[PDB]
DNA sequence: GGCCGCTCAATTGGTCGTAGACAGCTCTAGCACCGCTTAAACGCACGTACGCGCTGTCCCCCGCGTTTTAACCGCCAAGGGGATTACTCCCTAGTCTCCAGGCACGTGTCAGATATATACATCCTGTGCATGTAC
DNA sequence: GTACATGCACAGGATGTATATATCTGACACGTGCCTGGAGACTAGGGAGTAATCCCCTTGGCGGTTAAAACGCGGGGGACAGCGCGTACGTGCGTTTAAGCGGTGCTAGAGCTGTCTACGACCAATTGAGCGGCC
């Protein structure tokens, strides 16, 4: 009982296992949310968060700046054939578009 | 009144040029305006049905985001 | 039935001078 | 004052103090170019 | 020259991040299209920005698909028939 | 009063691990919160189907392992399944 | 290797239901690739539902749930 | 006929002040989450009852290998319809302002349609049989 | 002109259900305060227009060869019985999460403090074009 700790810290996660369990159990996704589900899901969300942030951080550094902006996220996801399936029909606020040409356009 | 014409000829030129097209035949404008208006019409109608159900007068950013989920044409960064 | 704005008007009017005076006394030190 | 020009100009400042006033010693300054335009009657300079 | 500044224009709007449609014309157009769904609506300032981002994105994707139609038919010049082909084979209408 | 309930702390705790030199803009925080929120709804939605598709009452690691294998594409699916099994392995002792 | 058993005549018939006036000889071999990759989507999803159910047998429900997830629902199988 | 002499109108270099917008607080307060209960229903492990799906040999219209041809592919050069870009003026989009009013949320207490204990009954699913529609 | 799949009824248990009960979510009425509809004044870029002029798409004639359509050559796909590995019921046992009521942490807010870049702006140096002298 002395000194409580997060179920995230017990899993070895940043992502909030309590919050994820609370959201699963009030979202009516099941009548019985077993605690392995929110731990596993928090880990899945944390991995996808790490992958998408690392690609965005590379895109930001390649664009010579030390901050993630929605442009650096669009220039991460539209440069990855995996995340361009997972996010393949989502729109990014301030993201713009990938720079692209059909070769038939180019002069001389 | 007559607001569909407010999608200006340079604005079509620019939006099509972000889309990478080389030559705009002058036939393009009114069909592009009508197509846009019909996509707006669907999103707005859906957002209005969420707003009417919610017993509410103000269309929120959530209602347009939920209309974009209902249409499977989602938009991140406006919340949710 | 028609004077109904007054009980809204007074609540904003008393806020105007109070917040301007509050900010004008962050200018104390 | 060199930035918020409209928002000063909309109020009729009747009489002007301008202070440590060596700041206006060049006509090339955007300060001098702007500050000429406020419709006050009397201008008083406090040159240290 | 013509078609060369039209091509050089592509790289500027594909690098740059801002919205291309004018805010007030778009804002009135949303309210106009809403009038015969309901009168006397209020629109939150964030909602119309979201609707504009969705509409410019929908058109940019439709313009790529339009460019695909034209260039497949060996045209650098787009035509309304490219939009009729795309809006059919999209499965939309 | 209402409260924003965002994932902002945790996406930042992860950024500061993967790129210690790099920060998050307020609009990119929005995109990240949207991505986490949507993937949670996508996975938990499919997990609720996967329970009733076997008429099981619970959801557990196997329902979400299945939902990840269905929803995610190539390499990301095996990596997410590896991370979920690693976290549950540490959590269960 | 059994995909070659999907016949050039059957691919003509299957295209002719789509109303095409004339075929070209490259279509038959490319259609076999399109059919194989479409199966390599829907089967792997159906197997994933089959594995979740602890089954050895791929049921009507296993393929219906895959086709429903792929957004190409088929009425007349399962329920 | 040519170059440089004095003057003053000129780019080209460092501190002041701000404002955007995080970054990290810098707390701090509150509300979820964690802890350690008391408890019971869904899942497993277990066997059992059995279609159901693999795997064997028959057999015809379908698969597949070669025939001429005629209309469609696609080239080439004409040829004229029309898109871009030249340029300036005009007007309405941007911008922030500010009101005053509507109405989204806050937030309080009351109360009614819902969950659910258990007691009914009639609804409508598996199997059989009668017989007629598409082939 | 044919008879296997449809179409109607029996047998019967479960599921659709009524009466009986306690109560938390939703309704309502109150106001705060957030903020959006309206609407004003001005800026000056976006847009439309007149306009010049350059070049692409369609067009029409023509030559090539591929699929179409026909035909010949010959076998594997649709259909019946046995084999034997799975799939669906039902129970005991209890693993597992429920649902509970506090103890505590950490997550969230608004704001501060600290950037701290990065931007105009002012301030002082020092330099090139401006006009005049000389042999």
mmCIF file of N, CA, C and O in Angstrom, chain A residues 38-72:
data_model
loop_
_atom_site.group_PDB
_atom_site.id
_atom_site.type_symbol
_atom_site.label_atom_id
_atom_site.label_comp_id
_atom_site.label_asym_id
_atom_site.label_seq_id
_atom_site.Cartn_x
_atom_site.Cartn_y
_atom_site.Cartn_z
ATOM 1 N N UNK A 38 -5.705 -3.155 -22.180
ATOM 2 C CA UNK A 38 -5.202 -1.787 -22.133
ATOM 3 C C UNK A 38 -3.677 -1.708 -22.036
ATOM 4 O O UNK A 38 -3.099 -0.786 -22.598
ATOM 5 N N UNK A 39 -3.001 -2.664 -21.396
ATOM 6 C CA UNK A 39 -1.530 -2.705 -21.416
ATOM 7 C C UNK A 39 -1.019 -2.921 -22.836
ATOM 8 O O UNK A 39 -0.189 -2.158 -23.331
ATOM 9 N N UNK A 40 -1.554 -3.930 -23.520
ATOM 10 C CA UNK A 40 -1.177 -4.243 -24.891
ATOM 11 C C UNK A 40 -1.488 -3.063 -25.820
ATOM 12 O O UNK A 40 -0.647 -2.645 -26.610
ATOM 13 N N UNK A 41 -2.674 -2.469 -25.688
ATOM 14 C CA UNK A 41 -3.092 -1.345 -26.511
ATOM 15 C C UNK A 41 -2.253 -0.096 -26.247
ATOM 16 O O UNK A 41 -1.821 0.552 -27.195
ATOM 17 N N UNK A 42 -1.953 0.221 -24.987
ATOM 18 C CA UNK A 42 -1.051 1.315 -24.657
ATOM 19 C C UNK A 42 0.319 1.104 -25.315
ATOM 20 O O UNK A 42 0.847 2.021 -25.938
ATOM 21 N N UNK A 43 0.864 -0.114 -25.265
ATOM 22 C CA UNK A 43 2.117 -0.429 -25.935
ATOM 23 C C UNK A 43 2.031 -0.256 -27.462
ATOM 24 O O UNK A 43 2.934 0.312 -28.075
ATOM 25 N N UNK A 44 0.936 -0.694 -28.086
ATOM 26 C CA UNK A 44 0.692 -0.522 -29.528
ATOM 27 C C UNK A 44 0.641 0.962 -29.901
ATOM 28 O O UNK A 44 1.327 1.395 -30.831
ATOM 29 N N UNK A 45 -0.126 1.759 -29.154
ATOM 30 C CA UNK A 45 -0.218 3.201 -29.362
ATOM 31 C C UNK A 45 1.141 3.869 -29.151
ATOM 32 O O UNK A 45 1.537 4.709 -29.954
ATOM 33 N N UNK A 46 1.888 3.477 -28.122
ATOM 34 C CA UNK A 46 3.221 4.007 -27.861
ATOM 35 C C UNK A 46 4.218 3.657 -28.971
ATOM 36 O O UNK A 46 4.991 4.517 -29.387
ATOM 37 N N UNK A 47 4.186 2.437 -29.513
ATOM 38 C CA UNK A 47 5.021 2.085 -30.657
ATOM 39 C C UNK A 47 4.660 2.917 -31.892
ATOM 40 O O UNK A 47 5.537 3.520 -32.508
ATOM 41 N N UNK A 48 3.375 3.000 -32.244
ATOM 42 C CA UNK A 48 2.962 3.793 -33.399
ATOM 43 C C UNK A 48 3.303 5.270 -33.199
ATOM 44 O O UNK A 48 3.746 5.938 -34.129
ATOM 45 N N UNK A 49 3.179 5.760 -31.968
ATOM 46 C CA UNK A 49 3.614 7.098 -31.580
ATOM 47 C C UNK A 49 5.114 7.272 -31.772
ATOM 48 O O UNK A 49 5.540 8.279 -32.324
ATOM 49 N N UNK A 50 5.936 6.314 -31.350
ATOM 50 C CA UNK A 50 7.378 6.403 -31.521
ATOM 51 C C UNK A 50 7.768 6.395 -33.003
ATOM 52 O O UNK A 50 8.528 7.256 -33.439
ATOM 53 N N UNK A 51 7.214 5.470 -33.788
ATOM 54 C CA UNK A 51 7.506 5.353 -35.214
ATOM 55 C C UNK A 51 7.143 6.642 -35.967
ATOM 56 O O UNK A 51 7.958 7.189 -36.710
ATOM 57 N N UNK A 52 5.937 7.171 -35.745
ATOM 58 C CA UNK A 52 5.467 8.351 -36.466
ATOM 59 C C UNK A 52 6.204 9.623 -36.011
ATOM 60 O O UNK A 52 6.535 10.467 -36.844
ATOM 61 N N UNK A 53 6.540 9.750 -34.719
ATOM 62 C CA UNK A 53 7.349 10.865 -34.221
ATOM 63 C C UNK A 53 8.777 10.811 -34.752
ATOM 64 O O UNK A 53 9.307 11.840 -35.155
ATOM 65 N N UNK A 54 9.411 9.642 -34.777
ATOM 66 C CA UNK A 54 10.778 9.517 -35.278
ATOM 67 C C UNK A 54 10.858 9.882 -36.769
ATOM 68 O O UNK A 54 11.730 10.651 -37.179
ATOM 69 N N UNK A 55 9.908 9.414 -37.585
ATOM 70 C CA UNK A 55 9.833 9.816 -38.989
ATOM 71 C C UNK A 55 9.609 11.326 -39.131
ATOM 72 O O UNK A 55 10.250 11.974 -39.958
ATOM 73 N N UNK A 56 8.740 11.911 -38.307
ATOM 74 C CA UNK A 56 8.504 13.348 -38.324
ATOM 75 C C UNK A 56 9.728 14.153 -37.858
ATOM 76 O O UNK A 56 10.026 15.205 -38.420
ATOM 77 N N UNK A 57 10.470 13.663 -36.866
ATOM 78 C CA UNK A 57 11.698 14.289 -36.379
ATOM 79 C C UNK A 57 12.802 14.255 -37.427
ATOM 80 O O UNK A 57 13.454 15.269 -37.673
ATOM 81 N N UNK A 58 12.947 13.131 -38.130
ATOM 82 C CA UNK A 58 13.826 13.051 -39.291
ATOM 83 C C UNK A 58 13.390 14.046 -40.375
ATOM 84 O O UNK A 58 14.209 14.832 -40.841
ATOM 85 N N UNK A 59 12.099 14.094 -40.722
ATOM 86 C CA UNK A 59 11.591 15.044 -41.708
ATOM 87 C C UNK A 59 11.856 16.510 -41.309
ATOM 88 O O UNK A 59 12.254 17.318 -42.148
ATOM 89 N N UNK A 60 11.697 16.852 -40.027
ATOM 90 C CA UNK A 60 11.966 18.186 -39.492
ATOM 91 C C UNK A 60 13.455 18.562 -39.558
ATOM 92 O O UNK A 60 13.812 19.640 -40.041
ATOM 93 N N UNK A 61 14.332 17.648 -39.127
ATOM 94 C CA UNK A 61 15.789 17.809 -39.177
ATOM 95 C C UNK A 61 16.283 17.908 -40.618
ATOM 96 O O UNK A 61 17.097 18.774 -40.924
ATOM 97 N N UNK A 62 15.756 17.090 -41.525
ATOM 98 C CA UNK A 62 16.050 17.172 -42.962
ATOM 99 C C UNK A 62 15.594 18.512 -43.552
ATOM 100 O O UNK A 62 16.320 19.123 -44.335
ATOM 101 N N UNK A 63 14.445 19.034 -43.114
ATOM 102 C CA UNK A 63 14.010 20.402 -43.398
ATOM 103 C C UNK A 63 14.661 21.467 -42.477
ATOM 104 O O UNK A 63 14.158 22.584 -42.355
ATOM 105 N N UNK A 64 15.810 21.142 -41.864
ATOM 106 C CA UNK A 64 16.737 22.038 -41.143
ATOM 107 C C UNK A 64 16.164 22.751 -39.906
ATOM 108 O O UNK A 64 16.730 23.756 -39.473
ATOM 109 N N UNK A 65 15.070 22.256 -39.312
ATOM 110 C CA UNK A 65 14.393 22.870 -38.146
ATOM 111 C C UNK A 65 14.239 21.881 -36.985
ATOM 112 O O UNK A 65 14.054 20.685 -37.189
ATOM 113 N N UNK A 66 14.282 22.383 -35.751
ATOM 114 C CA UNK A 66 14.247 21.574 -34.511
ATOM 115 C C UNK A 66 12.842 21.401 -33.908
ATOM 116 O O UNK A 66 12.712 21.119 -32.715
ATOM 117 N N UNK A 67 11.767 21.567 -34.693
ATOM 118 C CA UNK A 67 10.377 21.402 -34.229
ATOM 119 C C UNK A 67 9.536 20.594 -35.219
ATOM 120 O O UNK A 67 9.597 20.807 -36.430
ATOM 121 N N UNK A 68 8.705 19.691 -34.706
ATOM 122 C CA UNK A 68 7.657 19.027 -35.480
ATOM 123 C C UNK A 68 6.542 20.036 -35.766
ATOM 124 O O UNK A 68 5.917 20.562 -34.840
ATOM 125 N N UNK A 69 6.249 20.260 -37.041
ATOM 126 C CA UNK A 69 5.081 21.005 -37.536
ATOM 127 C C UNK A 69 4.291 20.095 -38.482
ATOM 128 O O UNK A 69 4.879 19.161 -39.031
ATOM 129 N N UNK A 70 2.979 20.296 -38.681
ATOM 130 C CA UNK A 70 2.165 19.396 -39.503
ATOM 131 C C UNK A 70 2.716 19.141 -40.908
ATOM 132 O O UNK A 70 2.559 18.047 -41.443
ATOM 133 N N UNK A 71 3.437 20.108 -41.483
ATOM 134 C CA UNK A 71 4.174 19.940 -42.741
ATOM 135 C C UNK A 71 5.226 18.824 -42.679
ATOM 136 O O UNK A 71 5.325 18.020 -43.598
ATOM 137 N N UNK A 72 5.977 18.734 -41.587
ATOM 138 C CA UNK A 72 6.969 17.681 -41.356
ATOM 139 C C UNK A 72 6.307 16.314 -41.117
ATOM 140 O O UNK A 72 6.859 15.297 -41.517
#
